[PDB]
Design a protein around this ligand. Sequence first.
Ligand SMILES: OC[C@H]1O[C@@H](O[C@@H]2[C@@H](O)[C@H](O[C@@H]3[C@@H](O)[C@H](O[C@@H]4[C@@H](O)[C@@H](O[C@@H]5[C@@H](O)[C@H](O[C@@H]6[C@@H](O)[C@H](O)O[C@H](CO)[C@H]6O)O[C@H](CO)[C@H]5O)O[C@H](CO)[C@H]4O)O[C@H](CO)[C@H]3O)O[C@H](CO)[C@H]2O)[C@H](O)[C@@H](O)[C@@H]1O
Ligand code: NA
Ligand code: NA
Length: 134
Amino acid sequence: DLKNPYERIQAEAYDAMSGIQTEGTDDDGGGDNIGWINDGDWVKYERVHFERDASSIEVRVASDTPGGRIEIRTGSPTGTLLGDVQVPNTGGWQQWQTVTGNVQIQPGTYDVYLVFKGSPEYDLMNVNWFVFRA
Ligand SMILES: OC[C@H]1O[C@@H](O[C@@H]2[C@@H](O)[C@H](O[C@@H]3[C@@H](O)[C@H](O[C@@H]4[C@@H](O)[C@@H](O[C@@H]5[C@@H](O)[C@H](O[C@@H]6[C@@H](O)[C@H](O)O[C@H](CO)[C@H]6O)O[C@H](CO)[C@H]5O)O[C@H](CO)[C@H]4O)O[C@H](CO)[C@H]3O)O[C@H](CO)[C@H]2O)[C@H](O)[C@@H](O)[C@@H]1O
Ligand code: NA
Ligand code: NA
């Protein structure tokens, strides 16, 4: 029941959430994406076990708006900030790109939260999966 951070975690495989919804994605691979994301929403992924230090994160994302950013925290949605990535407009809700942002994560078993931040005036983005790099 540990999750491997160095292979893809599907955004839809969350253990808790606030304010989000899932739909079938068009992206390469099939499955679902999360969506209907607004400033302040989040998703929690339990038991993410890092065996080596991570220095970046890759997120598969889409946006039909000015976009927003993804905060990586642990423990809780107001837990320590380990990194972020900004998701830009990408042309569409189903126009997928892979962004990358720096993180600093020591070895450890964490509850990983992706907290979504941006303007309250529009939905921010869709997310499909993510994976870390050492
Ligand atoms: O269908 C499933 C999906 O549903 C999603 O929910 C959406 C909901 O958010 C939407 O509400 C709209 C809202 O999105 C809109 O906000 C404006 C933004 O779109 C924003 O975007 C501009 C963007 O428009 C522009 O994009 C185009 C370009 O990229 C393209 O290639 O070409 C055309 C030219 O012909 C371009 O126009 O890109 C610019 C950057 O260059 C970007 O800033 O701009 C403004 C801010 O200025 C936002 O206000 O606003 C509307 C208010 O009227 C809302 O109606 O509604 C749809 C349909 O009802 C709804 O489905 C979920 O969030 C999602 O997860 C799910 O997948
Ligand atoms: Na939402
Ligand atoms: Na997915």
